[PDB]
Amino acid sequence: QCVNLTTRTQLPPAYTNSFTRGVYYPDKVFRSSVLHSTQDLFLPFFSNVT
């Protein structure tokens, strides 16, 4: 079964300044007072989040 909903208010999405969000834990390890340099799949700061 499938019914056409229609009423498509076709509006474009906007852009927002992603400031510092999107930082996760790159590995499964504990570090205490350690500044660690990683390289992994990340979201850059001040990005254009939709």
Binding site: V29, R31, V34
Partner: protein, 50 residues
């Protein structure tokens, strides 16, 4: 892990406790002797261990 990037604490997977791993406690051997003509006995110094 630590600043030197080595394993020093692991999580016990059955009982959820946190242990720490202090190393194998090796060291050097320094032998304190007079001359062979003077005497024949030595003293042994172990480098920096309890």
């Amino acid at each position: 892990r630590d600043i030197a990037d080595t394993t020093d604490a692991v999580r016990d997977p059955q009982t959820l406790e946190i242990l720490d791993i202090t190393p194998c406690s090796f060291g050097g051997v320094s032998v304190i002797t007079p001359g062979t003509n003077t005497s024949n006995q030595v003293a042994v110094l172990y480098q920096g261990v309890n």
